[PDB]
Design a protein around this ligand. Structure first.
Ligand SMILES: Cc1ccc2oc(=O)ccc2c1
Length: 544
């Protein structure tokens, strides 16, 4: 059916959206923008299209295998307390007279509404449930993106989704998909898995596969198959019912309502802001892509899936032969309703593959041993840092990036330096901050960063040094592009920040010792001193 239909009501912003940047970080302010509701119409047109889906034996057989692993999962209901506790403090308020504070505080109004909504889910498995549609405000750098579309139900329901399904989405995928399930990995563990399966092959080939607006390609069938996979678990008979009702009344589609309460149309594909979105997309992508691998007769495949993001590493059959089987894989994905954005291409070098917006690169530790780490073109992370350093923002990409990308040349020399300089200057190293990891919101203390890095990465991450020239280029190149100081300058700024940090002692001294040991010249020798990378909750309204 049609992915979306539109009345003509506009997608309407709730508050004023600043499209541009209000300068110690980057001179070229004008290359940095935020998407707004102004660009909705374009995104609307890219994401709205009909879906033809043609299954086959290869799909049916994979689905049957998934279902048998799923059948060995036990999962439980969460109490309202447990589900209320998972809500982020600044989650959108309900239209029925209570917000997230009340949810978090177990106010008997919020609880009693939630009981009413849970009750309605069990009595009625048919009425589509309302959703709100919103343009996202996301920052990037020039060379332009239309705002992405978020779609989400009222708070009362979000809390019900938790009761019904939090344990399924936190436990099932890793059982069904084993090592393919990407969100069970920290960065370090992810590099290790990619690198080791690269070396496990006689003659390796790998490829990323970019699905054209994945959410829109997901059909109502896809979502019901998905439901049927959850039902394989040993579930409470009430949980079994709420899940049926949630998928029929919400996951499958429903009316779309703007900030003004006008009706915008009707969704028949994935909602990006429900609890199952991450688990759904991951299971759905793993299913089709596994099917696609069989159609293409790809030998000895390893997959790594993160929502709609896919990498495959396998045995080469030769260059002609690989390219040809890649096209088959693509025809097969396209039959299953998941056609390609960029055409997918074979790569014979692990470092040249991008997945979850990252590629492996190689460097050396203090002994001179070769160490692998994940990195990326740093344009967006710097862009959003420039923004977060400028306007005030409730979420901090920079800290997330520090954590995700601690070993990188760009995160060490630029981010840590910049933000520790700012916290230092505003006497604010102590304040916990909200950042996002695999879509869950964590409150994190910057002073704890050394411990966090040693655990997610290893002591090596404070001492890496002979970075690949390709990496080094992309970095200084990005910096020229954006108008940010060259790396020589950061080294000098870091030397100073290192020093002030040490002069404060305790944990700020530890930050000085460990984080900026790269900057010194003659190095201090460094000695040693979660429930975090377990599953994906993007769009899922989660707080740990
Ligand atoms: C390990 C790893 C790799 C890529 C990622 O991409 C993201 O957008 C968010 C988190 C993340 C984590």
């Amino acid at each position: 059916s049609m992915s979306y239909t539109w009345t003509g009501a506009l997608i309407t912003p709730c508050a004023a959206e600043e499209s541009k940047l209000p300068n110690s970080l980057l001179r070229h302010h004008n290359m940095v923008y935020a998407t707004t509701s102004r660009s909705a119409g374009l995104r609307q047109k890219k994401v709205t299209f009909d879906r033809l889906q043609v299954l086959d034996d290869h799909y049916r057989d994979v689905l049957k295998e998934m279902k048998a692993k799923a059948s060995t999962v036990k999962a439980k209901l969460l109490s309202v307390e447990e589900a209320c506790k998972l809500t982020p403090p600044h989650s959108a308020k309900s239209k029925f007279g209570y917000g997230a504070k009340d949810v978090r505080n177990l106010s008997s109004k919020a609880v009693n509404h939630i009981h009413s909504v849970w009750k309605d889910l069990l009595e009625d498995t048919v009425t589509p449930i309302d959703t709100t549609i919103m343009a996202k405000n996301e920052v990037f750098c020039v060379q332009r993106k239309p705002a992405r579309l978020i779609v989400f139900p009222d708070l009362g329901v979000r809390v019900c989704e938790k009761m019904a399904l939090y344990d399924v989405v936190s436990t099932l995928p890793q059982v069904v998909m084993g090592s393919s399930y990407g969100f069970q990995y920290s960065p370090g563990q992810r590099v290790e898995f990619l690198v080791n399966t690269w070396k496990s092959k006689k003659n390796p080939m790998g490829f990323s596969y970019d699905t054209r607006c994945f959410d829109s390609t997901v059909t109502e069938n896809d979502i019901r198959v998905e439901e049927s996979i959850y039902q394989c678990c040993d579930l409470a008979p009430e949980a079994r019912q709420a899940i049926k009702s949630l998928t029929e009344r919400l996951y499958i589609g429903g009316p779309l309502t703007n900030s003004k309460g006008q009706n915008c149309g009707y969704r028949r594909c994935r909602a990006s802001g429900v609890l199952t979105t991450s688990c759904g997309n991951t299971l759905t992508c793993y299913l089709k892509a596994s099917a696609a691998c069989r159609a293409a007769k790809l030998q000895d495949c390893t997959m790594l899936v993160n929502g709609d993001d896919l990498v495959v590493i396998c045995e080469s059959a030769g260059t002609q032969e690989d390219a040809a089987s890649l096209r088959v894989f693509t025809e097969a994905m396209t039959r299953y309703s998941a056609p390609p954005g960029d055409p997918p291409q074979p790569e014979y070098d692990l470092e040249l593959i991008t997945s979850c917006s990252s590629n492996v690169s190689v460097a050396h530790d203090a002994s001179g041993k070769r160490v692998y780490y994940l990195t990326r073109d740093p344009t967006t992370p710097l862009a959003r840092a420039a923004w977060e350093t400028a306007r005030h923002t409730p979420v901090n990409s920079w800290l997330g990036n520090i954590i995700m990308y601690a070993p990188t040349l760009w995160a060490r020399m630029i981010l840590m330096t910049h933000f520790f300089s700012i916290l230092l200057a505003q006497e604010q190293l102590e304040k916990a901050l909200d950042c996002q990891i695999y879509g869950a919101c964590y409150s994190i203390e910057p002073l704890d960063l050394p411990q966090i890095i040693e655990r997610l990465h290893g002591l090596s991450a404070f001492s890496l040094h002979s970075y690949s020239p390709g990496e080094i280029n992309r970095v200084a190149s990005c910096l020229r592009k954006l108008g940010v100081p060259p790396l020589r300058v950061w080294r000098h700024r870091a030397r100073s920040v290192r020093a002030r940090l040490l002069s404060q002692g305790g944990r700020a001294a530890t930050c000085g010792k460990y984080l900026f040991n790269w900057a010194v010249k003659t190095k201090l020798k460094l000695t040693p001193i979660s429930g975090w990378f377990v599953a994906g909750y993007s769009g899922g309204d989660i707080y740990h």
